[PDB]
Design a protein around this ligand. Sequence first.
Ligand SMILES: CSc1ncccc1C(=O)N1CCCC1
Ligand SMILES: CSc1ncccc1C(=O)N1CCCC1
Lengths: 300, 237
Amino acid sequence: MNTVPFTSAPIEVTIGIDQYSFNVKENQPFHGIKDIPIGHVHVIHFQHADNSSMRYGYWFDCRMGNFYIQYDPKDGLYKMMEERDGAKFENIVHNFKERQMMVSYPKIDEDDTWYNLTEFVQMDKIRKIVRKDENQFSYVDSSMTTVQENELSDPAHSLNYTVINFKSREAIRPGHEMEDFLDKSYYLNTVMLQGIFKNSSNYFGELQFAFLNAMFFGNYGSSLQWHAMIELICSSATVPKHMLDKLDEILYYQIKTLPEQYSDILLNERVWNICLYSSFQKNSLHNTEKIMENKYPELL
Amino acid sequence: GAMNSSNYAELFNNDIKLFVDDTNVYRVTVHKTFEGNVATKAINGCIFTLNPKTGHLFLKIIHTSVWAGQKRLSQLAKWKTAEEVSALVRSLPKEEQPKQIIVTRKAMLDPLEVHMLDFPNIAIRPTELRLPFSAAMSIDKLSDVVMKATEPQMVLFNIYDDWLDRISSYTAFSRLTLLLRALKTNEESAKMILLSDPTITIKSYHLWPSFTDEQWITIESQMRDLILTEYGRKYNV
Ligand SMILES: CSc1ncccc1C(=O)N1CCCC1
Ligand SMILES: CSc1ncccc1C(=O)N1CCCC1
């Protein structure tokens, strides 16, 4: 179990760690989060109390280094940093634990929620979507735009998700216009899976990362990517059986985790009704359709 | 974006554009089978592709053989229309290709956009106007060439005859839409009006009779009366 110590908490802030969150008061004796499960990526995220604008955060994997948080009073945010001095870090953490200055990652033993949300998400792929190669962790915030959003403005600060456009020469084979537009299997299986992602695990990893960014940061672009990747599968007549079964599980846990009161800002009526009720896969997502119909029947 | 009554005059500027109407591409008669079920029999159709500034009509005849063995024909018809319009654009020299294509029905937007991805600078636009182009098969010489076709065929017409020698393309389009609206609302009467005077003939190389300017005014008035007449008969006004 790993630890992300905090130097201090000088401004009042709501701190998220994965699907959990807690309030820290201004100058409260808070010095970080312990007992973080090894084996998964994690995200630690922030919303300042005095300006809920700019929610932001950091994706990280404690196996890749020793990371801590320190508030920067010039740039006005909590920054993730790497400590290269291993013995310094271990000594810092131990003192904070002995003084019980850390909150515990509050994982219930029955609970696989975080695994199920991050099953295919890897740090190496996060770092290709979010380009800042001098750090081992990745910053994301509410305002960052995707490459697709910018085609339609600072490129160093973009989310490099795979572009998905249904009316694009990449999506549509000359001479198969109607075929490829009404059945997107060529685009899914040949262009995207065989060609760009190489395998379904990488595709699901980007889908899951886009959902998590959309939900934790209120990032609109990430929400568009997430919906686009779902629709591309549901709008394909030929999808491997194992991919459909896994997609149903992925979406089930995403819908299960969504705040009930954000379903207006995180769910696209058109995509979901199309996917569950009109698409080729309308009958292949039993778990997702049941939780959607019982939790968000208004949207449908 | 969409073409409506506010931007109506853009049709007659010097940017090449085409209207595409697909309402006569897939045509059927519905009949009873020996077992008392219902079936359809397709008949030849046509794509109506019109330059409203010059009157040039590219009439692509859709022969019933293109439907053989195909499913979901009303949906296929929109994609076949888009395929043929794209093929027509590619056949034209660059300097004759349209800058805009206006579709009369919104269901043609995606099929035509997809077939025209190679032409990103050609705008595909809908219209809010209710244009009477469905009545093109009430023009006798157009209906004749469509029904006689034994194979796919493109036939070229000027739907304005020689009108542009004497009137502008705004006025010519207005005359055309009035004639088509009349033929659409009461074909028998409209044709009666157009041919009631045997001394006015249709030249072999024209679609409409050789009316003088003064006679067109009478004709146009008789057509408005017909449209108003039918409006009253329809609504009991
Ligand atoms: C997840 S999108 C989001 N979330 C939080 C705050 C604002 C937005 C946003 O830009 N939205 C645009 C359409 C739906 C909401
Ligand atoms: C990933 S979908 C996306 N992303 C960024 C900006 C716009 C869109 C979007 O909804 N689009 C609809 C048609 C093509 C673009």
